[PDB]
């Protein structure tokens, strides 16, 4: 693509500069270029990829939610007709958001997931796949909504199965996967009991394994455990 003439190492260096500059669309474009070199990604590089796109899509999701809220209010009894503009602009943001999700899913399918054999990489990419289908599901309203939801579920479930076999209960990737799959259950799948049960079980199994950890791993794990607790407190 536009990044085809740039060295892999240079793309990764520039992604790191972009992150420092809070230039996340640039960071995402550099990391896309790095993925498209065809080599597998290191742990650090996977995390750059994730951070870049999470920031890009997160801003799009937040904008979408503002615009959706205005649109919903426009459709209430006694609201003055204002024309097509709110819908059109929400649609514009939505289409851009869908395009970013499709980009990420495309990188995962061509060819990050098929090349990922270690649990660290495979679980990470399948979690990503679940997350970006989840973002698609947040804005879906048509005939494919159930299939989009099922695609997120399937990716998360594959990731969960691997992580339970291959990772300790404190592993931060495992914990973050469980966190996000619980959010899927609560926010997308209309399954708050499943969400609560997964978060509880995850938290408790992690707690029981903290004794095995170094101080620095303890910190890493407990930070994500607190996010599980935050959701449990919100949900109960």
């Amino acid at each position: 693509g536009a990044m085809g003439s740039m060295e892999r190492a240079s793309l990764i260096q520039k992604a790191k500069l972009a992150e420092q500059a809070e230039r996340y669309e640039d960071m995402a474009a550099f990391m896309k270029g790095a993925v498209e070199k065809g080599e597998e990604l290191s742990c650090e590089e996977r995390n750059l990829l994730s951070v870049a796109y999470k920031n890009v899509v997160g801003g799009q999701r937040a904008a979408w939610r503002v615009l959706s809220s205005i649109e919903q209010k426009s459709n209430e009894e006694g609201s003055e007709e204002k024309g097509p503009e709110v819908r059109e602009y929400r649609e514009k943001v939505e289409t851009e958001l869908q395009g970013v999700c499709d980009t990420v899913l495309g990188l995962l399918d061509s060819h990050l997931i098929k090349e990922a054999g270690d649990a660290e990489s495979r679980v990470f990419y399948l979690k990503m796949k679940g997350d970006y289908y989840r973002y698609l599901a947040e804005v879906a309203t048509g005939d494919d909504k159930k299939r989009i939801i099922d695609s997120a579920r399937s990716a998360y479930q594959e990731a969960m199965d691997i992580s339970k076999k291959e990772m300790p209960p404190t592993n931060p990737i495992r914990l973050g996967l469980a966190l996000n799959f619980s959010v899927f259950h609560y926010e997308i799948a209309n399954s708050p009991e499943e969400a609560i049960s997964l978060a509880k079980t995850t938290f408790d199994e992690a707690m029981a394994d903290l004794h095995t950890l170094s101080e620095d791993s303890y910190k890493d794990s407990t930070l994500i455990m607190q996010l599980l607790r935050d959701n449990l407190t919100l949900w109960t």
Partner: peptide, 6 residues
């Protein structure tokens, strides 16, 4: 407060 993801 929204649900927290990571």
């Amino acid at each position: 407060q929204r649900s927290t993801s990571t």
